[PDB]
Write a protein that binds this ligand. Structure first.
Ligand SMILES: [Mn+2]
Ligand SMILES: [Zn+2]
Length: 351
């Protein structure tokens, strides 16, 4: 294998045509081939004007952006684009796809959180931004316009969902929207505070305590974030932290040149899939989840090598390890995926 060249993108804020133009011009002038694209959020995946109610942007600035052109098939994403949610989202769409999903051709949402595999890499995504008051709130479903202010705040439960994922092998890349709290102090923060003197106020507390815990636990080779509209680099132990800007502005896109360990299509990660199935009982009520009367970490402690093997066989049987486009509406996708999770969990016959 020669190498894979991965585009990493900060905030999109609805500017898809422009992003893809810049990516194409990069290929043209470098002769390099982009394998795939990863975006750190503000994806604004509004299908139609009805979704505007779920986008938290001041009314004077609120627009559709470009997404609907891709949803309708008038434009077509030229690269496989993997993304997480930020603070400017069609949040209803994302909640229907909380277990991940393609929003249109070549655009795959990682859900609230998940790990995926592509070309031998394991990639973790953590959606939203941090708000302390909401970190223990459940999601209520179906979405309603009242929830526009809260749907995009990162829940604490993602830490328990994700923390065992580096036990069998290291995570190559983790993605979040807001920065891991404290990582500002591990780069050229002085230089940063000249460009952005508003950040000085926050000092070491700038960013998400949830993304901090995850970074600490998984210690990925790379952690990528956006949201702040500036470039930044920091080293935290074995983790290279990279923060990226916003499309239309400088340093919105960068590129990772990584070994091509294997060439494989996009797949569900086996460890993640075991975690997803083993936590079904906390996610049993479609109208309100998770149910924190259950303990997620208690649910996960029941995993064994032998039982994980069974989970994967059933997942392979009903869903398949390859992540593939689904043309059902997102509400139907919510039902279908949760149907198979539940069915697989129940076949395990766990006491
Ligand atoms: Mn943002
Ligand atoms: Zn942004």
């Amino acid at each position: 294998g020669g190498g894979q060249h991965i585009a990493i993108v900060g905030c999109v804020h609805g500017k898809y045509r422009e992003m893809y133009r810049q990516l194409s011009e990069y290929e043209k002038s470098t002769g390099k081939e982009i394998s795939f694209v990863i975006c750190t959020g503000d994806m604004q995946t509004l299908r139609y004007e009805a979704d505007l109610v779920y986008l938290k942007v001041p009314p004077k600035y609120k627009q559709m952006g470009d997404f609907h052109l891709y949803y309708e098939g008038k434009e077509k994403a030229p690269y496989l684009t993997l993304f997480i949610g930020g603070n400017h989202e069609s949040s209803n769409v994302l909640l229907h796809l909380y277990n991940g999903g393609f929003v249109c051709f070549n655009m795959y949402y990682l859900g609230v959180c998940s790990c995926i595999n592509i070309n031998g890499l394991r990639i973790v995504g953590v959606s939203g931004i941090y708000k302390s008051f909401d970190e223990k709130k459940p999601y209520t479903y179906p979405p309603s316009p009242n929830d526009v202010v809260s749907l995009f705040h990162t829940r604490n439960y993602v830490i328990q969902m994700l923390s065992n994922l580096s036990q069998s092998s290291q995570i190559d890349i983790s993605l979040s929207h807001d920065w891991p709290q404290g990582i500002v102090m591990k780069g050229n923060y002085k230089q940063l505070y000249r460009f952005q003197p508003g950040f000085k106020k926050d000092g070491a507390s700038l960013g998400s305590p949830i993304n901090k815990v995850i970074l600490n636990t998984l210690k990925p080779k790379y952690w990528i974030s956006g949201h702040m509209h500036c470039e930044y680099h920091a080293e935290e132990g074995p983790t290279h932290f990279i923060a990226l800007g916003k499309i239309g502005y400088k340093n919105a896109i960068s590129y990772l040149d990584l070994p091509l360990k294997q060439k494989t299509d996009l797949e569900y990660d086996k460890d993640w899939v075991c975690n997803l199935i083993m936590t079904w009982p906390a996610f049993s009520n479609k109208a309100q989840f998770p149910d924190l009367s259950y303990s997620i970490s208690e649910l996960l402690s029941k995993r064994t090598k032998e039982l994980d093997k069974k989970i994967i066989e059933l997942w392979e049987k009903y869903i398949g390890l390859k992540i593939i486009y689904d043309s059902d509406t997102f509400d139907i996708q919510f039902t279908s995926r949760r149907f198979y999770i539940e069915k697989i969990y129940n076949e395990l016959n766990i006491n």
